[PDB]
Amino acid sequence: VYGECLGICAQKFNGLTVLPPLLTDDMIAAYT
Amino acid sequence: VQKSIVAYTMSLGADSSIAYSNNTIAIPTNFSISITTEVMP
Numbered sequence: 627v628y629g630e631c632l633g634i635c636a637q638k639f640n641g642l643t644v645l646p647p648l649l650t651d652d653m654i655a656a657y658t
Numbered sequence: 659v660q661k662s663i664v665a666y667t668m669s670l671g672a673d674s675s676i677a678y679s680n681n682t683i684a685i686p687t688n689f690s691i692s693i694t695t696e697v698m699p
């Protein structure tokens with residue numbers, strides 16, 4: 627398998643963005 | 659620290675471990691009864 631930030635951050639002029647989750651994939655992996 | 663707002667990395671859960679055994683088994687030798695409250699609209 628809009629603005630964002632990885633890790634550097636970047637923004638778009640369209641006023642859109644996506645927020646990160648509280649629990650990252652690694653944290654989930656630990657649960658499973 | 660006197661208190662203040664602090665940041666931290668969250669814990670996922672309690673740190674616990676049980677040894678594996680192919681020879682022994684653990685079983686309860688007592689019990690208790692408790693009541694849980696649940697609400698729904």
Ligand SMILES: *[C@@H]1O[C@H](CO)[C@@H](O[C@@H]2O[C@H](CO)[C@@H](O[C@@H]3O[C@H](CO)[C@@H](O)[C@H](O)[C@@H]3O)[C@H](O)[C@H]2NC(C)=O)[C@H](O)[C@H]1NC(C)=O
Pocket residue numbers: 633634635
């Ligand atoms: C947020 O903005 C600040 C300011 O630009 C970024 O800080 C800068 O981070 C880089 C990498 O840690 C620092 O080192 C630089 O590496 C490049 C690699 O090619 C090199 O060409 C530069 O000369 C320099 O060595 C850079 O010194 C640092 N700037 C300051 C003022 O500390 C910061 O990383 C940005 N945040 C994120 C998440 O990117």
Ligand SMILES: *[C@@H]1O[C@H](CO)[C@@H](O[C@@H]2O[C@H](CO)[C@@H](O[C@@H]3O[C@H](CO)[C@@H](O)[C@H](O)[C@@H]3O)[C@H](O)[C@H]2NC(C)=O)[C@H](O)[C@H]1NC(C)=O
Pocket residue numbers: 687688689
């Ligand atoms: C499972 O564990 C529970 C406690 O966690 C046990 O219940 C307790 O059993 C004692 C009888 O042995 C009850 O009476 C106590 O007797 C002593 C004797 O001196 C006295 O000092 C205490 O004040 C008390 O009277 C005790 O009240 C009881 N606990 C409760 C909450 O009722 C239970 O028997 C265990 N089950 C098995 C199968 O071992």
